[PDB]
CSV table of N, CA and C in Angstrom, one decimal:
chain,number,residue,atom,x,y,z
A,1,UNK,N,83.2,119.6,131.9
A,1,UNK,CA,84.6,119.4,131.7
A,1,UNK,C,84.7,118.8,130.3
A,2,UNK,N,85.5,119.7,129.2
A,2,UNK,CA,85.5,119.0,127.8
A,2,UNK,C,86.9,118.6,127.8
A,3,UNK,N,87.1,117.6,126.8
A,3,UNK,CA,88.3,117.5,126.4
A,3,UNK,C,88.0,116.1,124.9
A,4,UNK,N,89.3,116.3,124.6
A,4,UNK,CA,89.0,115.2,123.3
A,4,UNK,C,89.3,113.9,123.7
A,5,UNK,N,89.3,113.1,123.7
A,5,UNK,CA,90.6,111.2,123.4
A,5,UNK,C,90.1,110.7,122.6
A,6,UNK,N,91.0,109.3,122.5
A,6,UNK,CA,90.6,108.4,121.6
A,6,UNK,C,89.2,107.5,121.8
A,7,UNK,N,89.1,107.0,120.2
A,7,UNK,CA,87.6,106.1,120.7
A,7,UNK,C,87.4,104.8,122.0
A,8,UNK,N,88.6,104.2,122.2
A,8,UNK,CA,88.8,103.3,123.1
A,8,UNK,C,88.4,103.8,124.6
A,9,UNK,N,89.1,104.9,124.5
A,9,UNK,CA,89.4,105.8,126.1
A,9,UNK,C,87.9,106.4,126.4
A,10,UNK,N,87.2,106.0,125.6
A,10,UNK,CA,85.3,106.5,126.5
A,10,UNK,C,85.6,105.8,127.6
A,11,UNK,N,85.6,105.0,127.6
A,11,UNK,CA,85.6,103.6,128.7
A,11,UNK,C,86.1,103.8,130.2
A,12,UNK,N,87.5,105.0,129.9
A,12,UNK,CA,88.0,105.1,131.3
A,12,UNK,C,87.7,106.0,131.4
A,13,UNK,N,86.2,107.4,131.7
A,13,UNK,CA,85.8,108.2,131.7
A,13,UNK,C,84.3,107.5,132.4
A,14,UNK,N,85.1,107.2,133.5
A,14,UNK,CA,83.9,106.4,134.6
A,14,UNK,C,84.6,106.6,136.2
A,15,UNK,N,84.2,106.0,137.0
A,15,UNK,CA,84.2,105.9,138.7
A,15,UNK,C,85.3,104.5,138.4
A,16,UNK,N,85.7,104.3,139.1
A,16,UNK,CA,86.3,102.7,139.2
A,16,UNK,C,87.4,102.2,138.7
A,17,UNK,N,87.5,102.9,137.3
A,17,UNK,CA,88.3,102.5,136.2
A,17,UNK,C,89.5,102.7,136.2
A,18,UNK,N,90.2,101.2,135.5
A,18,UNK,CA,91.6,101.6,135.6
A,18,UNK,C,92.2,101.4,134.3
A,19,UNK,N,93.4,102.7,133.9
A,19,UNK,CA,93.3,103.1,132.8
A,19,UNK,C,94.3,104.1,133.4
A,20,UNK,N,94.6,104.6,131.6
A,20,UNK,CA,96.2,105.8,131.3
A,20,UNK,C,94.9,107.3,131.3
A,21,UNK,N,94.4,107.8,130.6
A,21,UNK,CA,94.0,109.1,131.2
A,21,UNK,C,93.4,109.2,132.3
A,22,UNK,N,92.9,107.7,133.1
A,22,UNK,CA,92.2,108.0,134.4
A,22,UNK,C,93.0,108.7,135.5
A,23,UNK,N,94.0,107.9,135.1
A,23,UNK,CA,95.2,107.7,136.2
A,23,UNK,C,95.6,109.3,135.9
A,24,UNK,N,96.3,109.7,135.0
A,24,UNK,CA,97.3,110.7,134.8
A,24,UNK,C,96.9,111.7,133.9
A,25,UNK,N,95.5,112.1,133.2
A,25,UNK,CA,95.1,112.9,132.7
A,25,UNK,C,93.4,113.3,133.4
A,26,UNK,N,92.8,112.4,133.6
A,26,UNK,CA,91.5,113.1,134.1
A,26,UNK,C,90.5,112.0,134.6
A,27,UNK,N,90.7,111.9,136.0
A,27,UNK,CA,90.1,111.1,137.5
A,27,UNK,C,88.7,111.8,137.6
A,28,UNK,N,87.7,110.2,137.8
A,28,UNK,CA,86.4,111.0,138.1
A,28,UNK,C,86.2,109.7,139.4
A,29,UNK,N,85.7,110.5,140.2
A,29,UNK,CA,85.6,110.0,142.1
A,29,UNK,C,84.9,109.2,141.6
A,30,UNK,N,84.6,107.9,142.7
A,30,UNK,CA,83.8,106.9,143.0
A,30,UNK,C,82.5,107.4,143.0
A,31,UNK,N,82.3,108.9,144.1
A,31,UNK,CA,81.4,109.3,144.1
A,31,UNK,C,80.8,110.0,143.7
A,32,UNK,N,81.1,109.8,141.7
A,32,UNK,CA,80.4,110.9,141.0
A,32,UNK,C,79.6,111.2,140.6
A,33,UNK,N,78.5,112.1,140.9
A,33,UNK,CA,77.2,112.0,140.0
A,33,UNK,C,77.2,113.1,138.7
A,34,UNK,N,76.3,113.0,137.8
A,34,UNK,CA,76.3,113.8,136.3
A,34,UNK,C,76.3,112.6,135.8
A,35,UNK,N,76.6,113.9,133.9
A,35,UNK,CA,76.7,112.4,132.9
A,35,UNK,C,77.9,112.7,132.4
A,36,UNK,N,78.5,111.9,131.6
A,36,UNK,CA,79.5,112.0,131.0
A,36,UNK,C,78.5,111.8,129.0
A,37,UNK,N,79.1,112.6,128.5
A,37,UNK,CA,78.9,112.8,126.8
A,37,UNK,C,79.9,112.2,126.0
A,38,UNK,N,79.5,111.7,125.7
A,38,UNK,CA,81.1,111.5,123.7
A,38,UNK,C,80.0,111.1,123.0
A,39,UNK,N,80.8,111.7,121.6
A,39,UNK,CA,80.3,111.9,120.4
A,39,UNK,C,81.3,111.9,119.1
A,40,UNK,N,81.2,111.2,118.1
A,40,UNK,CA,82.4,110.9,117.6
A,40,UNK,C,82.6,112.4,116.5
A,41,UNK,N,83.9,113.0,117.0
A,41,UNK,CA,83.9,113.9,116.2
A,41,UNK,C,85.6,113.7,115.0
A,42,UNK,N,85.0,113.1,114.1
A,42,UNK,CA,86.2,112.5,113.1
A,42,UNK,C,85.7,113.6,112.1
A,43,UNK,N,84.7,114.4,111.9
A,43,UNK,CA,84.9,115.4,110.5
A,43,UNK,C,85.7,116.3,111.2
A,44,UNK,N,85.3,117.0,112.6
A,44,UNK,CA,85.9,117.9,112.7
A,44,UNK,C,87.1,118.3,113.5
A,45,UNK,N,87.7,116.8,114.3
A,45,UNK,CA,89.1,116.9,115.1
A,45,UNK,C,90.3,116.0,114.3
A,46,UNK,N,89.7,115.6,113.2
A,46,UNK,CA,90.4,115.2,112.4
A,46,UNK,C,91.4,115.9,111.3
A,47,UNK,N,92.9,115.6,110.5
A,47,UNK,CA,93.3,116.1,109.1
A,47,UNK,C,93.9,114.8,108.7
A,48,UNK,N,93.9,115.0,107.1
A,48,UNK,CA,94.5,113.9,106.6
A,48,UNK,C,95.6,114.1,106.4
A,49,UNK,N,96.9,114.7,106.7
A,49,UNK,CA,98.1,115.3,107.6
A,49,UNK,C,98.1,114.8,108.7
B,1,UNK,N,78.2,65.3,188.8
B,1,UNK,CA,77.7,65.9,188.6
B,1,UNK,C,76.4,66.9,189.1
B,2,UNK,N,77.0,67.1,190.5
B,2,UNK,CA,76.3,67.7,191.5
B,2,UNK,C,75.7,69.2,191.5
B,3,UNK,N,76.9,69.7,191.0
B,3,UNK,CA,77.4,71.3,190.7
B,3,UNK,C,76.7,71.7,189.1
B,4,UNK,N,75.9,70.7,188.5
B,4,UNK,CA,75.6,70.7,186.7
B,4,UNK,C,74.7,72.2,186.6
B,5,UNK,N,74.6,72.9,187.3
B,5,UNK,CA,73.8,73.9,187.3
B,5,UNK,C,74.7,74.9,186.7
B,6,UNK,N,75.3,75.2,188.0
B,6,UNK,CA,76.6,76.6,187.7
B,6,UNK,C,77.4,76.3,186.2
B,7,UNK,N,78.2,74.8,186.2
B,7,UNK,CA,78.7,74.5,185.3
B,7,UNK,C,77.9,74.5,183.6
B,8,UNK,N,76.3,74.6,183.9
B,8,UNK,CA,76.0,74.5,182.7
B,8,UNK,C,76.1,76.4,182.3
B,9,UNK,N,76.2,77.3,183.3
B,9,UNK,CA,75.8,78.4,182.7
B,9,UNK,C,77.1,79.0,182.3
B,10,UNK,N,78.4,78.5,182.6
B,10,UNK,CA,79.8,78.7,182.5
B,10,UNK,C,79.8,78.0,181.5
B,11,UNK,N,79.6,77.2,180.5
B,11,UNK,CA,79.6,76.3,179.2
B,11,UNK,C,78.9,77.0,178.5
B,12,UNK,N,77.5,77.2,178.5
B,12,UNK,CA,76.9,78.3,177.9
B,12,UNK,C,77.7,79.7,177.6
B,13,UNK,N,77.9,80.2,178.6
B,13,UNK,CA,78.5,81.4,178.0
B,13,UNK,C,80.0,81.1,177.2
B,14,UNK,N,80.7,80.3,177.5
B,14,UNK,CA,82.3,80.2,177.1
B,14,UNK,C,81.7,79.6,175.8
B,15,UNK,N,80.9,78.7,175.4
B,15,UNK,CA,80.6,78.4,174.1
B,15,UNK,C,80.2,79.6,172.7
B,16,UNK,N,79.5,80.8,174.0
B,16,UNK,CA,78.6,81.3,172.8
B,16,UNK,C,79.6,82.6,172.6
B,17,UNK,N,80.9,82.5,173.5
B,17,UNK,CA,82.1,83.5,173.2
B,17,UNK,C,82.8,82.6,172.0
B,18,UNK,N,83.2,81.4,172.0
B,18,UNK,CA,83.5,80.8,171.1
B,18,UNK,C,82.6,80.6,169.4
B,19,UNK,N,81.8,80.7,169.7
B,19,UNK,CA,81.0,80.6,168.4
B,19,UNK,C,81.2,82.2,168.2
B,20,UNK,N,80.9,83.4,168.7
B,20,UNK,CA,81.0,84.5,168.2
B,20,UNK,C,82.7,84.9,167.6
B,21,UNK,N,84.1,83.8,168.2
B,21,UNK,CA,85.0,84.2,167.7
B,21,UNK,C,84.7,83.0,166.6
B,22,UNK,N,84.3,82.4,166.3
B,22,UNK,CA,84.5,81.3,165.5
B,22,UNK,C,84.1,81.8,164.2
B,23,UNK,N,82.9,82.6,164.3
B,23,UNK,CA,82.0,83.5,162.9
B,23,UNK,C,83.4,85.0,162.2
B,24,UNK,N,84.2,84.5,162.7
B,24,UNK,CA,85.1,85.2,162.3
B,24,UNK,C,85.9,85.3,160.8
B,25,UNK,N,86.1,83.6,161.3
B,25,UNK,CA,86.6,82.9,159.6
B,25,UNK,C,85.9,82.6,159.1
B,26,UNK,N,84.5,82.8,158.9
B,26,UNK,CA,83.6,82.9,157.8
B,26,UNK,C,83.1,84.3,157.1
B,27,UNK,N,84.1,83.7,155.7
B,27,UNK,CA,83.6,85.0,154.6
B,27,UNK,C,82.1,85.3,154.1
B,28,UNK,N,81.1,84.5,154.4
B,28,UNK,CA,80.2,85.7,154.2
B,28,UNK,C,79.8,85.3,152.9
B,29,UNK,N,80.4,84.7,152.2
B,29,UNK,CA,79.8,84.8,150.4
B,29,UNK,C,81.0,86.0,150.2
B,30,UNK,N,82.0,86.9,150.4
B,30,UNK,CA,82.8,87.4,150.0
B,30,UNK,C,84.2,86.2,149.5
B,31,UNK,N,85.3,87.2,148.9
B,31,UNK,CA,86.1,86.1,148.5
B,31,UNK,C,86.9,85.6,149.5
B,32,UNK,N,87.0,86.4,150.6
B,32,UNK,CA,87.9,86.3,152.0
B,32,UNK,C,87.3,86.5,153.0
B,33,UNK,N,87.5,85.8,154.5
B,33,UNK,CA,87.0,86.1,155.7
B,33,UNK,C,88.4,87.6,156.6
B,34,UNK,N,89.3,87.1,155.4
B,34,UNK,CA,90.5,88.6,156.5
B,34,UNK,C,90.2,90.1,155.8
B,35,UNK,N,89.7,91.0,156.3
B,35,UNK,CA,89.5,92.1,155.8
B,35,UNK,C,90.6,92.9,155.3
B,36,UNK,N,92.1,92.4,155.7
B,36,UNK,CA,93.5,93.1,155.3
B,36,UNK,C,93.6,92.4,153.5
B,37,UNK,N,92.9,90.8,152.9
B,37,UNK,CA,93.5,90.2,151.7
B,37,UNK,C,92.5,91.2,151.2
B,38,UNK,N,91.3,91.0,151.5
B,38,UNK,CA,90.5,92.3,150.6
B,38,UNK,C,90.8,93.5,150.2
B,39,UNK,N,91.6,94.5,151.5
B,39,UNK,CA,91.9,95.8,151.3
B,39,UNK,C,93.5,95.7,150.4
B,40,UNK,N,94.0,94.3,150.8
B,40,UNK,CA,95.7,94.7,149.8
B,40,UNK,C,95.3,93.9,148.6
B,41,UNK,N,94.2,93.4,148.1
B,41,UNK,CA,93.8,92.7,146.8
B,41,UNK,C,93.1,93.5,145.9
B,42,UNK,N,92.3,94.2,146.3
B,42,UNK,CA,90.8,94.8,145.2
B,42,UNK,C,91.3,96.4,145.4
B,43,UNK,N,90.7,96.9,144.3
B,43,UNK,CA,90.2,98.0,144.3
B,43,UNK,C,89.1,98.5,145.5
B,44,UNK,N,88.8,100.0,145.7
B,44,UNK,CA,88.0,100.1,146.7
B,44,UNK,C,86.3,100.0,146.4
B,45,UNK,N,85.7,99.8,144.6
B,45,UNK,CA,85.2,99.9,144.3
B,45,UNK,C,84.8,98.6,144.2
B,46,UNK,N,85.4,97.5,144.3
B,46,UNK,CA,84.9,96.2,144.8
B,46,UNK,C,84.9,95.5,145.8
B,47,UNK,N,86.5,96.3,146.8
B,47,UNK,CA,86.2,96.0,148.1
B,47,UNK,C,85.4,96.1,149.3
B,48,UNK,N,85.0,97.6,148.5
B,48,UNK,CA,83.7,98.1,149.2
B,48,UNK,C,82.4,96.9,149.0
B,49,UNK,N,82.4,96.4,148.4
B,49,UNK,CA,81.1,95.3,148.6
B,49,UNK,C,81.5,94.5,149.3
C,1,UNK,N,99.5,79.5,120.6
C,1,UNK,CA,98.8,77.7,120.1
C,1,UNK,C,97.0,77.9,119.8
C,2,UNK,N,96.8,77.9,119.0
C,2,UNK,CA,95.0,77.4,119.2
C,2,UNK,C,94.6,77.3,120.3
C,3,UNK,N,93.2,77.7,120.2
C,3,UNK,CA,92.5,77.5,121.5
C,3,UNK,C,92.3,76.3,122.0
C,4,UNK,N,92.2,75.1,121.3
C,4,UNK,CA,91.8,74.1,121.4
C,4,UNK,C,92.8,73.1,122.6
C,5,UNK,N,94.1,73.9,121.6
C,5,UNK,CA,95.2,73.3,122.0
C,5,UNK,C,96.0,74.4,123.2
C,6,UNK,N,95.8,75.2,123.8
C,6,UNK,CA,96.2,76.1,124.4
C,6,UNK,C,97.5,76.3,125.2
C,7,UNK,N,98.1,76.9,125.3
C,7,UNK,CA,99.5,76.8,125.8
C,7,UNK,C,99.3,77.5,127.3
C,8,UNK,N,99.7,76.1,128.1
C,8,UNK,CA,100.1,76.5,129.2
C,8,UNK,C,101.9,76.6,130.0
C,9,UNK,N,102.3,77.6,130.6
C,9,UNK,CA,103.6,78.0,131.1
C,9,UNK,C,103.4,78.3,132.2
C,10,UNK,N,104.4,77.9,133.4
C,10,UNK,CA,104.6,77.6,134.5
C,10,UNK,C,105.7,78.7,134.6
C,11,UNK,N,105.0,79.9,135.6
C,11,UNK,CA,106.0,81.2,136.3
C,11,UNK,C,106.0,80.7,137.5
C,12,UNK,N,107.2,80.9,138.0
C,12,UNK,CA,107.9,80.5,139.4
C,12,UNK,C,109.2,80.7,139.3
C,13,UNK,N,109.7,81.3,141.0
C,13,UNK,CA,111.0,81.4,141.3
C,13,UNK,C,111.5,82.6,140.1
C,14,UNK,N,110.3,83.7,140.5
C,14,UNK,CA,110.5,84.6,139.7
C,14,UNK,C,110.5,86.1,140.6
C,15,UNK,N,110.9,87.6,140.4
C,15,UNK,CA,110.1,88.7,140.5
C,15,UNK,C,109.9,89.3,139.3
C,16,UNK,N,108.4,89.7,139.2
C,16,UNK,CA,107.5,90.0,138.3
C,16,UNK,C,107.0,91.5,139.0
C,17,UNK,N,107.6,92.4,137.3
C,17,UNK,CA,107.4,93.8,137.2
C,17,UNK,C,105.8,94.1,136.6
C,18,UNK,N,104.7,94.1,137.5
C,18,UNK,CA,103.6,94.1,136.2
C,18,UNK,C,103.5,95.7,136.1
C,19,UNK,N,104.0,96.5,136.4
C,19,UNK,CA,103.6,98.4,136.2
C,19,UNK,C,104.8,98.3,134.7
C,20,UNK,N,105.1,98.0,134.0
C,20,UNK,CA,105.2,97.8,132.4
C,20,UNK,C,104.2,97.1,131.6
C,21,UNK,N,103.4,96.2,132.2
C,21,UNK,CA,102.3,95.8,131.8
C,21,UNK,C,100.9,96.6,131.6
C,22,UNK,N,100.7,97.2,133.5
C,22,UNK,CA,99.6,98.1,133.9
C,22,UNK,C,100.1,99.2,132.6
C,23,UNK,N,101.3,100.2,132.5
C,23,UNK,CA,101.6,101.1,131.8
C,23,UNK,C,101.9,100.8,130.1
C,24,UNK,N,101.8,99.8,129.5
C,24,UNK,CA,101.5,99.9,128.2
C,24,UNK,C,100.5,99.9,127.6
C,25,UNK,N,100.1,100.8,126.3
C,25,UNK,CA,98.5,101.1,126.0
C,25,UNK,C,98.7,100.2,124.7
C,26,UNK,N,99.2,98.9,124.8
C,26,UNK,CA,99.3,98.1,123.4
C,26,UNK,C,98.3,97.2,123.7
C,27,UNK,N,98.0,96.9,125.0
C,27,UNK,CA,96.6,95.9,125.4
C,27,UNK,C,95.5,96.7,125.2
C,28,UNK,N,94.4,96.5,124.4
C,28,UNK,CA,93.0,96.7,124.3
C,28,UNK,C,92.4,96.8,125.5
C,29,UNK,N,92.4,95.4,125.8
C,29,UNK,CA,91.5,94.8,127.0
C,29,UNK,C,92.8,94.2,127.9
C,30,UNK,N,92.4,94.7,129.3
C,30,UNK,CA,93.9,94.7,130.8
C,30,UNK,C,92.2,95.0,131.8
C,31,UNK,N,92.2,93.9,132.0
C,31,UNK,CA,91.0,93.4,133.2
C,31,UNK,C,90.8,92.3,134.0
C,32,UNK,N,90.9,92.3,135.1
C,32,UNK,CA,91.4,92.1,136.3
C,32,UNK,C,90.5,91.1,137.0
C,33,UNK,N,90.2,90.2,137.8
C,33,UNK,CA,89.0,89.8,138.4
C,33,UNK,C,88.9,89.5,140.1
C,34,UNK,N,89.7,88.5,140.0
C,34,UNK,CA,90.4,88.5,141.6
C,34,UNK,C,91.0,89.3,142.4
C,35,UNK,N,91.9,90.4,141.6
C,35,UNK,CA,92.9,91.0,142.1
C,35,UNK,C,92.8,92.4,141.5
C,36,UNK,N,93.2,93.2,141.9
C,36,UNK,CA,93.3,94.5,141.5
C,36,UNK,C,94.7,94.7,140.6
C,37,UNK,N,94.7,95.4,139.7
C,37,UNK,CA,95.8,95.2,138.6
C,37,UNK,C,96.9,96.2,139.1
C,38,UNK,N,96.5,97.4,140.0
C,38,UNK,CA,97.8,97.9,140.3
C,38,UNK,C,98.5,97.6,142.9
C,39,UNK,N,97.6,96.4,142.8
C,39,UNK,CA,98.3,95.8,143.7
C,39,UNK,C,99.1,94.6,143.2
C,40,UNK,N,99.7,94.0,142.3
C,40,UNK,CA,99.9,92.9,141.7
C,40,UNK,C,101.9,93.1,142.3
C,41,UNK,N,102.2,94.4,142.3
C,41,UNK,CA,103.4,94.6,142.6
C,41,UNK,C,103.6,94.4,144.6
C,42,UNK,N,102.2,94.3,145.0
C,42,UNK,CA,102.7,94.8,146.4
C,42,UNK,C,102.0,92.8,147.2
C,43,UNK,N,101.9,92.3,146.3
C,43,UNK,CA,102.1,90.8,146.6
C,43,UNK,C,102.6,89.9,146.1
C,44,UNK,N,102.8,88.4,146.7
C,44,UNK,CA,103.7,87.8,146.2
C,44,UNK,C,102.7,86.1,145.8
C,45,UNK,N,102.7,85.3,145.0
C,45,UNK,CA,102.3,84.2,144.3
C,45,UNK,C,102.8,83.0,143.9
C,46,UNK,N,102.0,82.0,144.0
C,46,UNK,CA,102.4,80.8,143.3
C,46,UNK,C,101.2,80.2,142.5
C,47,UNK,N,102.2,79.6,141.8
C,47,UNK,CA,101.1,78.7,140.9
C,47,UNK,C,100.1,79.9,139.7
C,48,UNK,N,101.3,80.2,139.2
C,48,UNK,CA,101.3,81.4,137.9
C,48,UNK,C,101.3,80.9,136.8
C,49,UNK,N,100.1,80.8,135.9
C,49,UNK,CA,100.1,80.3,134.5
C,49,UNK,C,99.6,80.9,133.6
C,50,UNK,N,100.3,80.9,132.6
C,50,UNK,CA,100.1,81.9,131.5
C,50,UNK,C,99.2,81.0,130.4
């Protein structure tokens, strides 16, 4: 499952967590196994616009 | 105290009904002994412990 | 106020909306210890200090 957020929002991209994309953009069960990845991508999801 | 026989086995049991309601109000090392403050307090990820 | 000197305020003989709280993303850090942060609406308290 890809998607972009902000650097704060790693954090609610967990089991348990309470938070604005947990809640209303992307819930992961208590009983999740996998891993979750981030990686900062500021060269390339970024414009200076 | 003629009858101390019968009467001790009627004390014994009515005590050890009371001691098993009594272990009721003790939490355990949790933060509550009522299982309803826990379920309308915590999340399920802490009230599950 | 400084830490030193810290401000404490007495909430009572109030109702308190905290889902404008839970829902603003202007708090960094909104973390909870005793209580779960989106039951806060479905109980009632005393002895509230800020």
């Amino acid at each position: 499952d890809s998607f972009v957020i902000r650097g704060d929002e790693v954090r609610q991209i967990a089991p348990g967590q309470t938070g604005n994309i947990a809640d209303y953009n992307y819930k992961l069960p208590d009983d999740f196994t996998g891993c979750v990845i981030a990686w900062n991508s500021n060269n390339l999801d970024s414009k200076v616009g | 105290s003629a009858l101390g026989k019968l009467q001790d086995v009627v004390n014994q049991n009515a005590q050890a009904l009371n001691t098993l309601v009594k272990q009721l109000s003790s939490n355990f090392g949790a933060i509550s002994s009522v299982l309803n403050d826990i379920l309308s307090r915590l999340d399920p990820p802490e009230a599950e412990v | 106020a400084s830490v030193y000197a810290w401000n404490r305020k007495r909430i009572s003989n109030c109702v308190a909306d905290y889902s404008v709280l839970y829902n603003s993303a202007s708090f960094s850090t909104f973390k909870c210890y005793g209580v779960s942060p989106t039951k806060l609406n479905d109980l009632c308290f005393t002895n509230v200090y800020a």
